[PDB]
């Protein structure tokens, strides 16, 4: 009945003065915009239909046309930034915010979804949705004693839209908006649905991707233990955002990092640092690199949890990006560590893989490795065992690699290699 209409027929129906004809044409538009392959969004926009749909959003007496137009506009807003902008330019934001209070749950859900797409376009539309007052009604939709009474799809859509309100930087979301959203986010972070958990973790990861004051806003809510628990989940879609959030948090101050450690995060890293998903391994090793950049007691907790052998493992075999993160972790470790910690590192077998990685073409990883070797040599000097370390490097085939780097294009690599050769070889 409303299937496979032409845009011409849709226009004729919507331009009729008959609300039922308008409803049928709007539903045909919705079905066109819901097709799997290349929905004709641009044709619908060029036909001038967005203002009509937006006006239909306000037909409180015809809830079906509200729903159909909300769905059509949601799918238009799901397209390119220009198509989302076409929806915003038609006045859709305040109309959808008004629909958030609809007594019909499917209409409220559709408005939530549409605002999620609009905010997901970027920081400008995110902040514009916020300025029009979306957060209060959105959060009111979740003000129930037990989230489990809400329909699963409804709650998932609310969580996703809230996550888009937390997303993007340059600028980051307004501080007052983040403080307004965070308590509901914590509650959602304790929900049992895997998709709600995943999107809540993503929102926290966004909110912690910034300066230390944003991180502090988050960690003062006490969510770090829940994030560690989720770090241990079996569902990769939960572990990925949980790990991103924990890594962001350990980019902060030593005290925030210590909050991560105290919550028991390090005990999860034997599995994370051997995870079959390359992205998990890379992100876990980056997190480790930022933990080894911390205090000597924090390096010591890395040692106690038995993680140095796992760093040697990643450095020995992993995708190259993860090996680069591991090199960074080793260099930070040797920069901040005691002499005893550095000798422990050597005793775990770091030198041979660290030397094998000097065969790489990336200049940055070579510089990182040369810095680490210099630090290890400084510790050896403090112990008077520099000759033993030199022999160690020579047996690995590393002296050849260093003396070869003496002929490298980068000045820093050149000078560092020559300095090592002159002082210790």
């Amino acid at each position: 009945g409303t299937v496979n209409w032409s845009v011409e027929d849709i226009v004729k129906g919507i331009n009729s003065n008959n609300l039922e004809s308008q409803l049928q044409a709007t539903q045909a538009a919705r079905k066109l915009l819901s097709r799997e392959k290349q929905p004709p969004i641009d044709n619908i926009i060029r036909a001038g239909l967005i203002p009509k749909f937006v006006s239909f959003l306000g037909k409180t007496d015809c809830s079906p046309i509200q729903f159909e137009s909300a769905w059509a506009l949601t799918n238009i807003a799901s397209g390119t930034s220009e198509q989302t902008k076409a929806v915003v330019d038609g006045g859709a934001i305040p109309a959808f915010i008004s629909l958030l209070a609809s007594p019909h749950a499917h209409i409220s859900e559709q408005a939530v979804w549409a605002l999620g797409n609009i905010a997901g376009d970027g920081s400008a539309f995110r902040d514009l949705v916020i300025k029009h007052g979306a957060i209060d009604p959105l959060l009111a939709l979740l003000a129930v004693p037990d989230l489990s009474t809400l329909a699963c799809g409804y709650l998932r859509n609310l969580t996703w839209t809230l996550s888009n309100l937390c997303r993007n930087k340059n600028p980051a979301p307004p501080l007052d908006a983040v403080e307004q959203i965070l308590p509901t986010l914590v509650r959602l972070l304790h929900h049992n649905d895997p998709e709600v958990l995943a999107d809540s973790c993503w929102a926290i990861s966004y909110l912690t991707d910034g300066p230390n004051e944003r991180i502090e806003m988050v960690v003062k809510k006490g969510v770090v233990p829940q994030l560690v628990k989720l770090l241990g989940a079996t569902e990769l879609p939960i572990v990925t955002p949980a790990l991103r959030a924990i890594g962001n948090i350990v980019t902060g101050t030593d005290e925030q990092t210590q909050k991560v450690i105290d919550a028991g995060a390090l005990a999860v890293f034997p599995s994370l640092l051997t995870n079959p998903k390359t992205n998990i391994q890379k992100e876990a090793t980056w997190t480790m690199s930022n933990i080894t950049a911390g205090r000597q007691d924090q390096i010591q907790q890395v040692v106690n949890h038995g993680l140095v052998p796992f760093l040697v493992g990643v450095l020995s075999k992993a995708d190259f990006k993860t090996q680069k993160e591991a090199a960074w972790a080793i260099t930070n470790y040797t920069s901040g560590g005691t002499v005893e910690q550095i000798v422990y590192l050597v005793h775990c077998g770091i030198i041979e893989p660290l030397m094998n990685l000097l065969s790489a073409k990336d200049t940055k990883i070579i510089q990182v490795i040369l810095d680490a070797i210099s630090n290890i040599f400084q510790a050896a000097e403090k112990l008077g065992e520099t000759e033993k370390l030199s022999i160690m490097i020579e047996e690995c085939g590393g002296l050849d690699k260093i003396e070869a780097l003496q002929r490298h294009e980068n000045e820093s690599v050149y000078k560092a290699s020559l300095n090592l050769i002159e002082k210790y070889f």
Partner: peptide, 19 residues
């Protein structure tokens, strides 16, 4: 030894079409 922040996301827009 300084902390290193995460790389900028290359996914700049997050939108969902309702099928």
């Amino acid at each position: 030894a300084r902390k290193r922040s995460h790389s900028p996301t290359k996914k700049l827009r997050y939108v969902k079409r309702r099928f």
